[PDB]
Amino acid sequence: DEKVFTKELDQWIEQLNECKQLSESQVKSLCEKAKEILTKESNVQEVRCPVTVCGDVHGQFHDLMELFRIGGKSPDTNYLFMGDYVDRGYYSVETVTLLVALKVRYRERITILRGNHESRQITQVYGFYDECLRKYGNANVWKYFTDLFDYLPLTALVDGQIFCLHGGLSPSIDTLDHIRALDRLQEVPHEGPMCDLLWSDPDDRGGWGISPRGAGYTFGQDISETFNHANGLTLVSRAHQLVMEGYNWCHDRNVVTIFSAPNYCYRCGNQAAIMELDDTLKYSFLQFDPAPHVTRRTPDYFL
Amino acid sequence: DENDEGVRGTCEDASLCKRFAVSIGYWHDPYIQHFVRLSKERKAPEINRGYFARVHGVSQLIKAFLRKTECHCQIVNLGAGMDTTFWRLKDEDLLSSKYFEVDFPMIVTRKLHSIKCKPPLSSPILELHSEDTLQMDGHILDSKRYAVIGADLRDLSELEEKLKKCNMNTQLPTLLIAECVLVYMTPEQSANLLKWAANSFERAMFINYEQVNMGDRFGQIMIENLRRRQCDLAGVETCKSLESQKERLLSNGWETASAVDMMELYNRLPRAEVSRIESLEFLDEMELLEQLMRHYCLCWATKGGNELGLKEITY
Ligand SMILES: *CCN(CC[C@H](N)C(=O)O)C[C@H]1O[C@@H](n2cnc3c(N)ncnc32)[C@H](O)[C@@H]1O
Ligand SMILES: [Mn+2]
Ligand SMILES: [Mn+2]
């Protein structure tokens, strides 16, 4: 029964910690149990502080291990992840398997949200499909994870005051009740509310604006301030954009961006950060560089 | 010695990347498939766009040289790798009097096997040859219009001898190409090479594509990353800035020099071309391209090009 299954999952977590991937069938089972859990979760995940908040990890497994050493291990540290677990880094399989495995093992202690890279089309291009097809001999595992991304909650709310999502705001959303009304169980659409949440970016431009990403929108400070005051919020927290120092305040502290993949793509040279929130929602940041992993192989340049 | 295997390994990298972009339609190359396998794992959009601009860049300067000399010239591709330019120039009817290629013997051996094995490669060379047979003794393929020489660029006596063995003429106008090559030898060694090139021809051109603005964190991480691949960038001290790159060329025997960083070149592309490429693949993070491209450059120098007007050449 599930008594036996919980014991096996400990062993899986033990295995993934040393960067050894799970078998094909092992992944199939884990994704089904995760599906049954995520179905019963809201589009807006209500979370209690203390919690530590993280952005883009992008298959940089060893740096996720660096994250844990610094923020503390799960479930001792209550965790909230804002998507983008796969692509670009070379260990998306191990990274996303472990984070799902921790969710199944400690549902109340881990929140994992959907990022824009948690999508079928994007993973076919930016490395995740290719990694599964190499690490396994077929697309089954890619299939199992991509099928699961459809169930990942879009949004989280820390103690009724701090609003967490991957990308940004939408002209198709004024309230949080507009978020819970959405049907998230689908591939991330090209346009529309669900799309914008995962793709949008803040900027210095006034009002809305055409996104240079070519999906979602660019929103100014005036949009943040309306959304915060209209929803009783003090802060919109997000990931999605490379920040050189690991985190970045904008819009007069209405928005903050957290990026948790240090030396992005193994090239960028950025610091990564994570945002701790204490028992009374007071914040602080933990900057960190990559772990010293001697066997990591080169990223692409022009040679 | 110790670094040479690693440096030779980079030819496989560039070849794989160039073929992949070609396979998904960045530019047209029916010949590279005979030299390297089709990578089954994708290269990221910024790599493909990056390789495109690099190829386009050099391609436009080659065309301009040929135009100005009316194809009455020599081209010497230095550290040529699996370069297909000979066959592509023959299709475009823009063939120079002779095409010379140079690389490590090991690399040349790989290229001579492919040429000898595959008629799509050997027939075009023979169509233009004085003999019915291609002769490949040693690490040299020599023919009337095309030569492939196995030599170390850091030993100039070996280089000069073999080019002249393949009947390179000093008095013809000559374009020399170093497409991501100079950075693999010491600053002094690449200076010697540039100096020799400038001294050998009264009328000449030099194209140098490589790293630039390397004096930052990005450049440092690259240096460290390539060392994991047992490949040290022996001439990074010369990759300081666009100004030092132009000064490297002028100090070493050339009369004019120009340099643009790859991104500057990217934004100066014809809008119709930009539109075609940007509809091939979707890149959501242009700041990644931006950072990469600002760390490479395309430089070109000339000398004795008055009568021909080589001072006026632009990408
Ligand atoms: C970066 C990979 N190649 C580029 C080959 C070609 N120009 C292209 O595809 O763009 C580098 C090549 O340069 C050769 N090389 C380095 N150093 C030497 C010396 N000292 N002598 C002869 N060849 C050299 C590499 O072998 C490689 O093919
Ligand atoms: Mn994202
Ligand atoms: Mn991301």
Q: 3-state DSSP call for residue B252?
A: coil
Question: Helices B119-127 and B105-117 sit at what angle, rounded to 10 degrees?
Answer: 90
Peptide bond into A75 cis (omega under 30): yes
Instruction: Give the closest residue to B103 by CA, choosing from B93, B115, B111.
Output: B111
Q: Compute, in angstroms, the gap from residue B232 CA to the centroid of ligand 1.
A: 13
Whole-angstrom distance, CA of residue B172 vs CA of residue B167: 11
Task: Give the active site residue among A62, A117, A178, A251.
Answer: A117
Whole-angstrom distance, CA of residue A91 vs CA of residue A292: 15
- CB distance A61 to A91 below 8 Å: yes
Whole-angstrom distance, CA of residue B168 vs CA of residue B147: 10
Task: State which approach was used to obtain the coordinates.
Answer: X-ray
What's the number of CA atoms in the CB half-sphere (13 Å) around residue B256? 16
Overall fold of domain B1-315: Rossmann fold (3.40.50)
CA angle (A129 as vertex; A52, A45 as ends), nearest 5: 30
Instruction: Give the closest residue to A203 by CA, choosing from A221, A215, A191, A216.
Output: A221
Instruction: Give the closest residue to A152 by CA, choosing from A81, A57, A60, A94.
Output: A81
Helices (H) and strands (E) in chain A, counts: 10, 13
Q: Percentages helix, strand, coil for chain B, rounded to the nearest 5? A: 50, 15, 35
- CB distance A93 to A56 below 8 Å: no
Instruction: Give the closest residue to B71 by CA, choosing from B101, B102, B93, B100.
Output: B93
The residues near B187 (Cβ < 8 Å, ≥ 6 apart) are B234, B235, B237, B238
Give me A173's structure tokens: 């959303």
Total count of domains within chain A: 1
Instruction: Please give the single-letter amino acid code of residue A300.
Output: D
The residues near A97 (Cβ < 8 Å, ≥ 6 apart) are A16, A21, A22, A27, A30
B171 CB burial (10 A radius; 0-12, 13-18, 19+)? exposed
A138 CB burial (10 A radius; 0-12, 13-18, 19+)? exposed
B107 lines ligand 1 (CB under 6 A): yes
Whole-angstrom distance, CA of residue A3 vs CA of residue B156: 74
What's the number of CA atoms in the CB half-sphere (13 Å) around residue B168? 26
B29 lines ligand 1 (CB under 6 A): no
B18 marked as part of a ligand binding site? yes
The residues near A250 (Cβ < 8 Å, ≥ 6 apart) are A202, A221, A256, A257
Beta strands in chain A (DSSP E): 44-47, 51-54, 79-81, 110-112, 155-158, 162-165, 201-202, 218-219, 235-238, 247-250, 255-258, 272-277, 283-288
Whole-angstrom distance, CA of residue B208 vs CA of residue B189: 15
Q: Are strands A44-47 and A155-158 parallel, antiparallel or unpaired?
A: parallel
CA-proximal residue: ligand 1, atom 13 (nearest): B79
- Segment A221-230 long-range contacts (CB within 8 Å, at least 24 positions apart): A221/A250, A221/A251, A221/A252, A221/A254, A223/A169, A224/A169, A224/A251, A224/A254, A224/A255, A225/A251, A225/A252, A225/A254, A227/A169, A227/A174, A228/A163, A228/A254, A230/A174, A230/A175
Instruction: Give the closest residue to B159 by CA, choosing from B83, B87, B79.
Output: B79
Please confirm, yes or no, whether A117 is among the known catalytic residues. yes
- CB distance B145 to B128 below 8 Å: yes
- How many other CB atoms are found less than 10 A from the CB of residue B268? 12
Q: Compute, in angstroms, the gap from residue B8 CA to the centroid of ligand 1.
A: 7
- CB distance B255 to B300 below 8 Å: no
Domain locations in chain B? 1-315
What number of residues does chain B have? 315
B167 CB burial (10 A radius; 0-12, 13-18, 19+)? exposed
Whole-angstrom distance, CA of residue B62 vs CA of residue B81: 17
- CB distance B33 to B9 below 8 Å: no
Which residue in chain A has the smallest CA separation from B227?
Answer: A298
The residues near B74 (Cβ < 8 Å, ≥ 6 apart) are B96, B97, B98, B99, B100, B168, B169, B172, B173, B174, B175
Whole-angstrom distance, CA of residue A190 vs CA of residue A215: 7
- CB distance A70 to A98 below 8 Å: no
**Domain carrying residue A221:** 1-303
B180 lines ligand 1 (CB under 6 A): yes
| Residue A26: C-alpha distances to residues A29, A139, A144 (Å) | 5, 15, 11
B103 marked as part of a ligand binding site? yes
Residue A247's DSSP bridge partners are: A258
Beta strands in A19-177 (DSSP E): 44-47, 51-54, 79-81, 110-112, 155-158, 162-165
Whole-angstrom distance, CA of residue A169 vs CA of residue A224: 8
CA–CA min distance A54, chain B (Å): 20
Question: What CATH number is attached to the domain comprising A255?
Answer: 3.60.21.10
Give me A245's structure tokens: 């120092």
- Where helices occur in B201-257 by DSSP H, the ranges are 217-228, 242-251
Whole-angstrom distance, CA of residue B72 vs CA of residue A248: 58
Beta strands in chain B (DSSP E): 74-78, 98-103, 140-142, 146-150, 174-179, 204-211, 256-261, 296-303
What number of residues does chain A have? 303
- How many other CB atoms are found less than 10 A from the CB of residue A69? 10
- CB distance A148 to A35 below 8 Å: yes
How far from chain centre, in Å, is Cα B132?
30
Interface residue ranges in chain B relative to chain A, Cβ cutoff 8 Å? 10, 13-14, 17, 40-45, 47, 50-51, 54, 180, 216-218, 220-222, 225-226, 228-229, 281-282, 284-288, 291-292, 296
